[PDB]
Design an enzyme around this catalytic site. Structure first.
Site, PDB file in Angstrom:
ATOM      1  N   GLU A  39       3.079 -16.225   3.484  1.00  0.00           N
ATOM      2  CA  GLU A  39       1.825 -15.778   2.872  1.00  0.00           C
ATOM      3  C   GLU A  39       1.998 -14.366   2.287  1.00  0.00           C
ATOM      4  OE1 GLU A  39      -1.634 -14.962   5.249  1.00  0.00           O
ATOM      5  OE2 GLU A  39      -3.064 -15.450   3.704  1.00  0.00           O
ATOM      6  N   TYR A 131      -7.623  14.242   8.863  1.00  0.00           N
ATOM      7  CA  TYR A 131      -8.254  14.236   7.555  1.00  0.00           C
ATOM      8  C   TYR A 131      -9.215  15.395   7.308  1.00  0.00           C
ATOM      9  CZ  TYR A 131      -6.248   9.513   7.567  1.00  0.00           C
ATOM     10  OH  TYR A 131      -5.427   8.406   7.712  1.00  0.00           O
TER      11      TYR A 131
END
Lengths: 170, 170, 170, 170, 170, 170, 170, 170, 170, 170, 170, 170
Positions: A39, A131
């Site tokens: 896949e 972040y």
């Protein structure tokens, strides 16, 4: 000590396949932890000429250490989503930060993007730190945006802009 | 006075085409107001068996009056996004309110969704009011998320949950 | 020191692959420095019968030292664009100059071109040096033509004509 | 007295086919004046989903009056090339200037480009006047870029920037 | 004794091939016990992007001990069918029970399913034992649902719900 | 007074498209009430040669009155599932009962099936009456099998056998 | 001493590829001296069933020595063009002549052609000799028919006929 | 009195078809006078994007009067072949002369060709005169180049160069 | 001593190819004794998903010993044709009988067939024995149904039913 | 000396390849002696399911000694053409005669043909000898049927019938 | 009074469609009385070049009256099966007899068949009489060969040979 | 009184379809008299570009009168086979002879063939007269070449040569 980005190659897919089946890791990307190789392979071939993404391998001294991708690159609105992973064995050595900088660098200095955003789990205070200290600020709290290992989770949307990344490291 | 939703049909495309080339309308959807009919016809055919979306025409007393769309239908996380347009000559008659309800009814009672969400212009003080009435709360302020008409805009992400809706219009 | 051009072969693509991910070098071609080997393959295959280009490998004593190409070959207006790259490990040996004149030879005496033109970075003094000794005149300066690594860059458009080449080389 | 842009539709193609065979007009786009309808038709179809261009019809009071196009839309470098034709019988009434700004408005306010540029024949001083009047500045003279009607011809590359256009129009 | 699920891989198909021709085992899945390896391959390839199923290999200390699958995954009605097989040489070790709960876990905590159901042979007492300890209730008895090896058989339809699973496992 | 079955033809499809968008009716087949004509059309074409179903129109005196279908025709196990709709304006005149036996006659006397079965909503006592009257017996109650119009719903599986039907009708 | 023709095989293409990149040799065929292997290969596969050509390898004592082809075989007008090459290392040993005879032989005795013609450079007096002595006579002088290594060249068209080859060697 | 060239259009094919089945006309082009319309329609569609040819209809006062064709357009050697037909009822009015000029103008002023050439029957003393007038000189006598109407014919190859033409009709 | 059926696999085709060219053996199946491998192969791939046949290999103590197939499986009429072969070296050891029983078993206990029939040569009294003793009875004598090694042959149609095989071995 | 026919296999094609380029041998089949191995492959693949031909390899003590074929098999008119070749190194051993009768056997006693016919060169006395001892009568002489190696040749058409063959061989 | 056979044409399909959905007619052919027109149209197109069948319409005085079909045309064994239907309103006029003769004439005099055969219901005492008249004899009693209308039926296989037919209607 | 050949067009096909179903006529081409229109149509399309044939309609005074064909046009051996039909109602007026020479003229003066040949039934002495009269000579008698209307039939092969025809007609 030395840390770089390079493109995700066909011959790197075996490495991606292992990460993409690790539930502990995939839960951070909010990605269902199930992937048959074929896949993965059939989807990587399908997106070869997709100009809306760039997938990278993260190398730490020539070793495969994690993945960074930029996705949903929209060029009229000049933004993209950023996402990253460090192999479990390469964790806690500073890598997420170094590799996030390389990413933003690519977004802002190569792709000429205006905005970069990301999504993180409200509980992932470790990552939110990285972040905030990089200059990302919070623009949203998406309540129950994801069902992950047994329950709804809240997701934090953080962003940062070109002029601000550029000012900060010039 | 009478208002229903039905599927968007091939024979409706022309009406959509005129809307899709109206800058003042299309700005509501953050949508570039350019579309050749052959592109619309093609993308419509491409998406016929696309399970992740449902496109509707809003009818008022048998007349076409606008468009509703549930898109990004994700069935693992049980959510979708919804958008709505009332054509200019039907504005001022309460139809958007009526269409949101029809839409929420759809995703909540038919599609078994857990969460519906929408994105509006921060300056769209009208509509933003219409959805707070309806139960929606604000979950993000998307900053400079769209370059529209010469400047970046902010988008308000607003959501409502199935339990809310079901409980209320029982 | 034997120097010659041959066409770019499939079995050379891995060599091209390295250079295409080499940011220092890609910056002067104004080329995003990102390329998966499968993208490079598909494109090289897509282009096999494109008669609008000629891609050469530059060989030095048989070992492969750089790339030189004529692209945008237009035969009505009888012109083409010229681009050259000498691999790092092979720089500073008089190779560019030599390869460049082999390329100019090729365009002027095989392709029957009237005009050859190139685009260089204003800051790229060693290339401009090399083009002026070859006989090229500056025809244009392109203002902010490319965003490269953080900022807009200025491009010089240089050109040279069949009669300025043929009336120098006997 | 009324002037609009709309997209180039499939059913505008016979109007395009007439202009594309009109040699006095096509010489101003540097374009060979020869086009079978089935060639136009097939090329229009091939480009329906090409996001690198946008073709428009110019309307004057509900009538086809001309054509304006943005092409080579490059979104990383945020530029496109601009071209316009006004039909002979609709010439000298001021429309070039209108449709031009309409089009520039589009590149700058809708497509978010940084730079718009254009090629004109060095002897088409009408057009050069219109583009100067409008804000464009000369940046190059391509010597003998085009062989048109019996001789080589020089093209002037002119540009304008977003900040310049937006400055001058809000 | 380490036990885990991974997706069914192409390189596992030979292992599946043996079990699919094993009549003793196929009888309980109500599956014709006939399969050429090329049929199994084509079908596995045909199904790669089918999102209505998840096929797992059951691993015991890394060596591959059986198969467990969720098929007929419907996300509107939020249910799936469960089937398990433990390879003979690996029976009677508490593997089914364990694999079964890993599968139930997966459907309930990753796929966000409301209902899981299965079909068993009325005479299959060791499986029914195992399902009742897992918490499944009998919802139906299907009269002569399958002709298996000479005679019509009776099928028990058992099911279990998200709140009966989640409120047992913390 | 006259009642027939004939095959579902391509030109009956607009009649099917109306019923398939009628929510009061579609709720009785557990079927989402949304269908663009082009979707119906494409799915009809896809199934033309599908030997696992047979779709019929119900005629009453030469008029389209409803639909009856046998589907999931499985010939090794010799069963199929049966469903019927009678148009609203043709309801309450006895036709469900007729077309039902017409259809059962078909499964039993033409297709040689052993077992016919059907799903009904536990609250659709009309239908349940009709099917009991007709010979069907309850064999299961699927708890919360369908989320329909705002809530989970229980379906009753009812069957009948060839020997039972043939007994009762020669 | 022994000299034969055989068909150009797939496994001979590596040999052709070397010749086809030798400018000194390709200039005699008026062929641009540039060929990527994949182009050669893709064109040889394309022409496998082309009945208008026969390509041969020339063997001198079992060694690959050159190429002869007959092309543009037209069967209504009963003629074809002839063309030949001898590897540089096999030159000056009589081969062109011996191999030209074999060719003509094939044209006239196998393909049942009426005429054979060839094109040679006016300056190539060596080759013109070979052909005058074989009985070819001049039917044209094409002025400036080819641009080759830097200038226009004149081409001599020579021919010979079936009855005359046949008379001469009977 | 008024005479132009335009591209050969699909809608012109029928007129071409009648000409293409006229033995007395087709003998001029050395062209077998047999053509089923479906073959012409097909070869026309095959060549739509064929850059090596341009087919024109000659119009006289808006009426179709014949055909011109530039074929074998080679842009490296900057030459093409031209052919022309005036339909039988338009002969005797000077139209061929006028069409050759239009054609030469085309290949010389639009296509930037260096050399145009044509092939006529040695017995076609009329036309052979028309081209000597026009500047053409003879460059070959193609002997028995065509089997036409029972016997082989000789063809005169005649050419003219760009410098000649440009200099003359300045 | 032990005798089983398994599916005909791709890797068994070499064995089938030998039998299918043995005239002595193929004459019993009334099959023309000629088969190129590629034909065999291309036909086996074509029928992989053909639900109307099951082809088996016959193993005697793990050795390939013969072939059994069931063909023309019709499921409405619930019948199929049976056919068998024992390699010449495995003949006279009881195998046909043992393998015929396995076949019938599969027809009647797995495929849920009502009838099995076969065709044999009137002269093949050996085989007719096997089948009479298995409970097959004669339903037809097809006169001159086949031309085999030089003359017409009569064929005996024998059959047996599910209830009778099942009664006999229960 | 064991002699038998088997079908022409893919792995025999290289053997066929040699004979197809062997002019001495091809002349009698009236076959152009030119064949690239890729042409031979494509054609053999194209013909795999052609039931109008049967190509055999002739085996002598298992080693492969020639080719024999029945082509143009028409079963309505129940005839075929016969062609044979014995490889040089295997001539003069009574092989043709033997192979020929195996072929005749095959056509007459397997294919059920009424008529077998062949075409021979009038000058081919050893073949005609061989056909007359086999029983063939001359039915026609085809005047100048083939141009072979420099001149028109005359072909004898011989034939033989099922009753002349079957009433000789018992 | 006037009766012929002609090929079944596309334009006849509608008439066939009505017949093919008539249970009382279709029972004669052992043929499930279900057919959507699009399935018939498709299978007709699938079989256009199918050499093993010939479908005819029976015409009586220019009016369509039924259908004849020769199927399973095997040319090695020189036999086919034939079937026939006379539409209900044409029954009682001798047409079936007349059609069988036309059919036999066809397969015997045109197709060069050796044996024709048919399958009738054992209870079809009418038709079974019509064929004994015609020369046919019984060669099998196919027992319970078809499940029709609720019970298995017996089919009479009846045949006639070419010699019989030819000899008789000479 | 006026007689022409033109090509067989797509719109002549219904006229061909009538003749091709006329058994008295088709027996003279040895052609089975059965042709569905869609078969003719598909075969015509398949052959549009087949250069091995040319099919003509015979016109008499602007009316379809018959068909003449050259087929199996083999250009190396320079032959084709010739066939003609004249419509029944246009028979006996001299047209066969005309169209025949018209056609021979074509093979000989246009297609440059060396030999034209034809097959006639040994009992069709009309035709044989016409062809003798015309120059054809007998070269073979194919015994029992065709089974037509109930019996084998002998065909006479007749030819003519270019030199013979051209001799006799200039």
């Amino acid at each position: 000590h030395s840390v770089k980005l390079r493109p995700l190659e066909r011959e790197d897919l075996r490495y991606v396949h292992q990460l993409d089946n690790n539930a502990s890791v995939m839960r951070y990307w909010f990605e269902e932890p199930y992937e048959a190789f074929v896949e993965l392979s059939d989807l990587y071939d399908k997106h070869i000429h997709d100009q809306s993404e760039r997938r990278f391998v993260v190398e730490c001294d020539g070793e495969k250490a994690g993945l960074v991708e930029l996705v949903e690159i929209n060029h009229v609105h000049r933004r993209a989503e950023f996402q990253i992973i460090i192999s479990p064995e390469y964790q806690g050595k500073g890598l997420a930060t170094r590799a996030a900088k390389l990413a933003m660098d690519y977004g802002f200095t190569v792709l000429n993007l205006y905005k970069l955003y990301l999504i993180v789990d409200k509980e992932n205070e470790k990552a939110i730190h990285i972040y905030r200290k990089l200059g990302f600020s919070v623009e949203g709290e998406l309540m129950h945006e994801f069902f992950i290992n047994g329950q709804y989770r809240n997701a934090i949307r953080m962003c940062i802009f070109q002029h601000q990344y550029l000012a900060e490291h010039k």
